[PDB]
Amino acid sequence: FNSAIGKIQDSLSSTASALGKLQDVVNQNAQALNTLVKQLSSNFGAISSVLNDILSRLDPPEAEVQIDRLITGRLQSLQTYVTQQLIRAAEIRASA
Amino acid sequence: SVLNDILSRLDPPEAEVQIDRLITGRLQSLQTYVTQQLIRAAEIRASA
Amino acid sequence: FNGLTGTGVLTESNKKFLPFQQFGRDIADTTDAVRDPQTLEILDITPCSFGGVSVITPGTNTSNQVAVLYQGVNCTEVPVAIHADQLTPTWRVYST
Amino acid sequence: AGFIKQYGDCLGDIAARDLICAQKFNGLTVLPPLLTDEMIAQYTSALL
Amino acid sequence: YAWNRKRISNCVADYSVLYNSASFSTFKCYGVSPTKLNDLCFTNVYAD
Amino acid sequence: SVDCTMYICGDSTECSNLLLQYGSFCTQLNRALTGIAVEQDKNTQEVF
């Protein structure tokens, strides 16, 4: 038993790969957040991806249309992210 | 319903708006499909 | 700065900007730092302090008394976000 | 990861002022776990 | 067909005077409100 | 259980036609809820 335990120390020490089951979870979440963060950049058909720009750029009557494009899109992205999390969370809770 | 006709008949300035509608729908549909897909797969996994 | 509008805290930074580079960006595709149009000085922009607010209360049947939680913020800032200085003394008690 | 790693860097900075990371930049915050890592060890030690 | 292009740069711009001129029959801007234009700063402005 | 037709279009022919343009989004949704509906009964039979 004693020698057996030491072997684990080596295997874990030797390769990180043993840890993939944990690593992917961290990786997946990181990826989800990154994707979620990156979405901010997408124009979504709006003239620009920056809210402060649009505000500085257009008067309200016109601006409302452009901002609306971002909101419907961005929210939809956020909606996408949440659904993924719920499903993913279920998997983890299943594991839990 | 056909992409080509919009391109054919309508000038791009007008077409862009039209295709955009079509895009959101299918993309929404695939989104519904994948989301639907994920859940069933989970059902399968538990079974597996 | 040059039309780039936003809110944050401007601090001197230790980034090694090249003489040509106007400004930098974060992973987010958001402005990480800028150099003044007036002075060739490098400034990192960190968005001003904010965080979630949660109310820790016992049952209302039990009591009215409450305790407020400011998520992920140093206690120093509570007077800052609030602009406690402006408020009446009744409000100020809560600040610190 | 790009963003997550960037977030960790945020925790590192003492010098920076008005640095409330929870904000990352756009409202995305990370709540801490209720059972701290130290605590988790005690459970496991007890469990052990 | 021959349309002339002029390059304008390295200055400060007062566009409001242009807007506050009764003289222009059509003053339509796609992207900027004619007002608040004073707030923007650009690398190159081309006039045709 | 939820019919899309009333929930969305409720007694509005002008509305409903516009719904058809949407395709199968409803028939699928109604199908799922029905599928869900039967499921609980299946659950009860399995348990008790």
UniProtKB/Swiss-Prot annotation, chain E:
Binds to host ACE2. RBD also interacts with the N-linked glycan on 'Asn-90' of ACE2. Cleavage of S generates a polybasic C-terminal sequence on S1 that binds to host Neuropilin-1 (NRP1) and Neuropilin-2 (NRP2) receptors. Interacts with host integrin alpha-5/beta-1 (ITGA5:ITGB1) and with ACE2 in complex with integrin alpha-5/beta-1 (ITGA5:ITGB1). May interact via cytoplasmic c-terminus with M protein. May interact (via N-terminus) with host bilirubin and biliverdin, thereby preventing antibody binding to the SARS-CoV-2 spike NTD via an allosteric mechanism. Attaches the virion to the cell membrane by interacting with host receptor, initiating the infection. The major receptor is host ACE2. When S2/S2' has been cleaved, binding to the receptor triggers direct fusion at the cell membrane. When S2/S2' has not been cleaved, binding to the receptor results in internalization of the virus by endocytosis using host TFRC and GRM2 and leading to fusion of the virion membrane with the host endosomal membrane. Alternatively, may use NRP1/NRP2 and integrin as entry receptors. This is Spike protein S1. It comes from Severe acute respiratory syndrome coronavirus 2.
